[PDB]
Structure 1
Amino acid sequence: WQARGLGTARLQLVEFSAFVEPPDAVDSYQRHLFVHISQPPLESVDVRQIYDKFPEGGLRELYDRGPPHAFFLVKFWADLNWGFYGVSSQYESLEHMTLTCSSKVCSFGKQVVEKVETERAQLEDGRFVYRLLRSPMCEYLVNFLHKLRQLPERYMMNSVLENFTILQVVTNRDTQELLLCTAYVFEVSTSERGAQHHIYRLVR
């Protein structure tokens, strides 16, 4: 009954990216992905080890109310060499729901920006999809990339990214119940390698 991917029986994640398109993309399009998830049981990380990096809206509260199986950790190795900055998310379910998608950016485990969005069902192939596509990146985060990208040393980037975390909570708006809560922790990938992720189940 343990998850094989990032999702529950009640809300799969299909794809997720954050990307930059250069102003030169109007003529000859190209995409650069800082992070990307496109979609044997997932490896397991104790939720108590990563309380310190998120508020106390907090990870402890949200796991306490549950459900435990909805909680996931993604480590990202960002690709940080490369305009419009966008984040695209897509989800699926078998229910018609209305989704509310709360993205908390935390620096040293304090909330620094929050984004909250709604997306309603679109029935496609017996399936409900929720397309949150090309949402413009929050200005702090685009600034946090340009500043982070000019660091002399990648261990400096990881040192900064050590204290930079993001908490996404996806809830049915109507029923107010939690569907999917994802903890993001960041490293920089080396320049020759592109973006990577490892996805864990948060347990207790």
Structure 2
Amino acid sequence: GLGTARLQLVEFSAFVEPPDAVDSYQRHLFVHISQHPLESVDVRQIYDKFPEKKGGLRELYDRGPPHAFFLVKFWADLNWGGFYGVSSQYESLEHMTLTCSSKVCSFGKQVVEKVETERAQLEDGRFVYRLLRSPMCEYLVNFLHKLRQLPERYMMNSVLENFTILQVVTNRDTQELLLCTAYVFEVSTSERGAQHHIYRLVR
């Protein structure tokens, strides 16, 4: 699964709860992972999709460690005053303070970047890092309304081809990379829910 033994992604989901969930609860997952041997992709294959910059995939991979670099292909479910949310959870056996850069690179050129710091919280013999029910970016929210309005699924996948996200979690105190995940996006069928495949970035 996703993670070094130093840090595992327990769960992550972007979601919307329809406004009627206050009465009777339901939630739409656009994308979801829950981990409460993996296949491999050669890192050079996706170099193009991301910066060739400082903070670009090649540079961070040279810094290492290579067992920290992953790819997650997402098949999003776009079949849906509401709440649009993103919630992520990681587990470690070390107490560290983490820094999580998430960069959106469209056409290989980074547009937006969020960097956040989360400190550990001890639970049942693991240190858990919790970033739950964060409100979704208005960038993403409007994007998704536009993308759902697209008439054909291949049209969504061709746009989503040109958008990629690089997530890098480092230890703030030691400034050493713990996890780097590249995300590529496609759209799932209506009958098929949100799906994902995880790969290890190799050389």
Quickly name the TM-score band, shorter chain normalised: over 0.9
CA distance in 1, matches of 2:178, 2:25: 35
Which secondary structure does the structure 2 equivalent of 1:81 belong to? coil
**Which residue number in structure 2 is paired with residue 102 of structure 1?**
101
Tell me what 1:158 maps to. Answer: 157
Greater CA deviation, 34-43 or 121-130? 34-43
Distance 2:24 2:111 in 1: 36
Return the alpha-carbon distance in structure 2 between the equivalents of residues 43 and 77 of structure 1.
17
Q: How many residues matched?
A: 200
Among 29, 40, 45, which residue is 2:25 paired with? Answer: 29
- Of 4, 9, 12, the residue aligned with 1:13 is 9
Tell me the alpha carbon deviations over residues 85-105 of structure 1, each in whole angstroms, 9 at most, x when there is no partner.
111110001100001111111
User: Separation in 2 of the partners of 1:127 and 1:28?
Assistant: 33
- Relative distance call for 1:30 and 1:40 in structure 2 (3 A) is closer
1:47 matched residue in structure 2 = 43
Matches within 5 A, 1:105-144: 105-144=104-143
3-state SS of 1:132 partner: strand
SS of equivalent residue, structure 2 residue 15:
strand
Q: Deviations over 1:109-151 (max 9, x none)?
A: 1111111111101011111000111111111111111111100
Whole-angstrom CA distance in 2 between matches of 1:40 and 1:153:
35
Per the TM alignment, residue 173 of structure 1 is displaced from its structure 2 partner at its CA by 0.8
Deviations 1:141-162 (A, max 9, x none): 1111111110010000000011
Relative to structure 2, which stretch is displaced further, 151-160 or 132-141? 132-141
Aligned-residue offset at 1:9: 1.1
Aligned-pair Cα RMSD in Å:
1.4
Report the Cα offset of residue 22 of structure 1. 1.3
1: CA distance between counterparts of 2:193 and 2:15? 12
Q: Which runs of 4+ in 1 moved over 3 A?
A: none
**TM-score normalised to structure 1 length:** 0.96
What's the offset of the Cα at 1:29? 1.5
2:29 and 2:172 map into 1 onto residues whose CA distance is 30
In 2, the alpha carbon distance for the partners of 1:162 and 1:63 equals 22
Q: Which runs of 5+ in 1 are unaligned?
A: none
Q: Identity rate of aligned residues, in percent?
A: 100
SS of residue paired to 1:24: helix
CA apart distance, 1:40: 17
**How far apart in 1 are the matches of 2:188 and 2:28?**
14
SS of aligned partner of 2:150: coil
Aligned counterparts of 1:46 and 1:55: Cα–Cα separation in 2:
16
Alignment partner of 2:4: what SS? coil
Task: State the alpha-carbon separation in 2 of the partners of residues 139 and 173 from structure 1.
Answer: 28
Q: Tell me, which stretches of 5 or more residues in structure 2 are unaligned?
A: none
Give, in whole Å, the separation in 1 of the partners of 2:79 and 2:106: 22
- Matched residues in 2 for 1:137 and 1:86: separation? 5
Tell me the TM-score normalized by structure 2: 0.96
Kept in 1: contact 2:10–2:36 (CA 8 A) = no
The answer on whether the counterparts of 2:11 and 2:36 sit within 8 Å (CA) in structure 1 is no
